[PDB]
Amino acid sequence: DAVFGDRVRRFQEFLDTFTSYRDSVRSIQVYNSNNANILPHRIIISLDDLREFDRSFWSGILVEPAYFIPPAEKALTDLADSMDDVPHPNASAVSSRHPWKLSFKGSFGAHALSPRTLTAQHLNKLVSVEGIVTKTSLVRPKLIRSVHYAAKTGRFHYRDYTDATTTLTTRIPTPAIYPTEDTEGNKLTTEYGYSTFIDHQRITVQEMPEMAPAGQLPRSIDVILDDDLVDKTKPGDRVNVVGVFKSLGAGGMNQSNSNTLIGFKTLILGNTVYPLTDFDIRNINKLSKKKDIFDILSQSLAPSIYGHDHIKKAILLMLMGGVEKNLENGSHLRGDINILMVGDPSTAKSQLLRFVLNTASLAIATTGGLTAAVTTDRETGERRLEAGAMVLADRGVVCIDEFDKMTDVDRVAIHEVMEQQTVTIAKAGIHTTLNARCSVIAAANPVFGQYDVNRDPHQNIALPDSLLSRFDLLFVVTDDINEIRDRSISEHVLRTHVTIPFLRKYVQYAKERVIPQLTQEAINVIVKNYTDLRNDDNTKKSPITARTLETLIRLATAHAKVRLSKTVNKVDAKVAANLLRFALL
């Protein structure tokens, strides 16, 4: 109608009143001409700019997408199809015919929702929804425009198609298949090389657990993506998606079909996907030069725990990590550090793990699919692997509670994770290797609840020695009662009846830039201390093996990162040797 043309010209005015939009289109046009990969025919519209140019048109997209967006799509397509002559001898007949799609940004107003908050009142509106990608459907091409040649008449022909999804407005459906005869009735010569197809995919978005109240099933919604958005996400990704929330089908309105249970199907026509200082740096490096920065950082860690200085120091060293190496033979050296905690269940283990899990930037909570060697199927039957915490925590940290409760299948898989930093997947028809360079911190408890301090965890907990030897540091804590001292810590509990934001920058910057190497200073210290430990036949937490030498190098390198020195020093080995003795006693 004439109203459709009016809004097409109105959008053309918007594309001209702010040349910052169509000049980027020209940049796309120039780039595409040079590559004779192709940049997408998509631009992002700032709703605030659209708000100040035409309030009704800006509100038109949000409130009435069916009557405003298709006029805007045509105007943008018209601008792109007319800004250049397209002198390509053959590409002008197929490639230049692809329409241009829109994207949106800026203030969404009231249309910023979640799968739970999304209701029937929000239908037929362009809304932004925040959630998680549970799964993705299979990608298939979808016919858009058909091109065919009428050989008998000696001239080509064409036909377009409409779908309930691709058409925001309720246009007449076209279920007809690619035509064989046209109005003239002659058999048509099919032109696949000049027909137009567009890929299509379906995804499911669910409300994030962070805002989910207990006692209700989770809320989910389906989003439709096409063309450039067809393969831009993977399951498990946090996503903010803007699209048209529209219904389809009928709730038994045809014939009688008057059951009270039938409802109308709804989904979102998504068109925009949002997958989810030097002053500090100079302060980070300056603070490293004071002698007590190692201890001060060791006290900001775990403010709710009194004492446990070595454990807090161990957490800092584990975050700093070591340095990996590569060899001319093709071998690689592990650099990361693992920590294990053992003793009475409720005594300060869940408290320490809570702080580390909350503080660390890439901390993953685990308890007894972490092996990442299992598949999940779509609605149509096709299946895809799901990632595991050990794999996801690459270059991160793994937080384990109830480590004693994990199964034997987990133990055999984590053997290669902690030692070779990789997972060798060997399944029926699926074989791959995934990096598992993750630091591990775990807590375990004895069966009886009360730890026998006279014996090692090999008899108090009875985990395999091969599994236990993979932890660089082990700590045993039990609430041995000193009444005046326990009063001091319990007073804060009875009261309930360096800044961390900068510290996380300190940890981030130190590991980001500092890659310490060994020095002759620590070489003698490592050999002498290792030999002395081998000479020491007295009972200890664990026997002395080459892994203890590896731990000393890893710990010394971590201390150098605390000092932010790209070379190790004798003091770093001295600290590591003392700490290992504490862990071995």
- Determine the 3-state secondary structure of 239 from DSSP: strand
Candidates 113, 126, 129, 150: give the one binding another protein (CB under 8 A).
Answer: 150
Question: Is position 93 an interface residue for another protein (rule: CB under 8 A)?
Answer: yes
Taking the complex as a whole, the smallest distance from the CB of residue 26 to another protein amounts, in Å, to: 24
Q: Does residue 75 interact with another protein by CB under 8 A? A: no
**Is 347 within any annotated ligand binding site?**
yes
Is 571 among the residues that bind another protein (CB under 8 A)?
no
* Binding of another protein by 123 (CB under 8 A): yes
Beta strands in 92-237 (DSSP E): 101-105, 112-113, 125-136, 140-150, 155-160, 188-190, 196-206, 220-226
91 is a site residue for another protein (CB under 8 A): no
Task: Return the residue of 20, 34, 35, 255 that touches another protein, per CB under 8 A.
Answer: 255
Residue 109 binds another protein (CB under 8 A) = no
Considering the rule CB under 8 A, would residue 225 count as an interface residue with another protein? no
Binds another protein (CB under 8 A): choice among 117, 153, 300, 478: 153
Q: Is the CB of 108 or the CB of 158 nearer to another protein? A: 158
Whether residue 531 is annotated as binding a ligand: the answer is no
Tell me the C-alpha distance between 295 and 300, whole Å.
Answer: 9
Choice between 48 and 160, CB closer to another protein: 160
Say if residues 575 and 562 touch (Cβ distance below 8 Å): no
Can you tell me which residue has the tokens 């770093």?
Answer: 572
Comparison of 421 and 551: residue with beta carbon closer to another protein: 421
Specify the stretch interacting with another protein by CB under 8 A; choose among 157-165, 284-292, 470-478, 556-564. Answer: 157-165
Write phi, then psi, for 216 (nearest 5 degrees): -135, 150
Handedness of CA 363, 365, 371, 374 (dihedral sign): negative
Measured distance between the N- and C-terminal CA atoms of the chain, rounded to whole angstroms: 86
SS3 429: coil
Any bridge partners for residue 274, and if so which? 240
Please count the residues of the chain. 585
Residue 198 as a binder of another protein (CB under 8 A): the answer is: yes
Residues 362-401, mask of contacts with another protein (x by CB under 8 A): ----------------------xx-x--------------
Residues ≥6 apart with Cβ < 8 Å to 498: 287, 296, 297, 300, 506
**Are 298 and 316 spatial neighbours (Cβ–Cβ below 8 Å)?**
yes
Interface with another protein, residue 238, by CB under 8 A:
no
Rounded CA gap, 168 and 78, in Å? 19
380 is in an annotated binding site: no
CA-CA distance, 363 to 357, in Å (whole number)? Answer: 5
According to the binding rule CB under 8 A, does residue 63 interact with another protein? no
Q: Which among 558, 88, 4 has a CA at the least distance from the CA of 298?
A: 558
Among 141, 236, 303, 368, binds another protein (CB under 8 A): 141
Binding stretches for another protein (CB under 8 A)? 64, 66-67, 89-90, 93, 119-120, 123-124, 141-142, 147, 149-151, 153, 155-159, 164, 168-170, 172, 182, 189-195, 197-199, 214-218, 234, 246-248, 250-251, 253-256, 258-261, 263-264, 266, 384-385, 387, 430-432, 434, 496-497
Q: Can you say which residues are annotated as belonging to the binding site for ATP?
A: 343-350
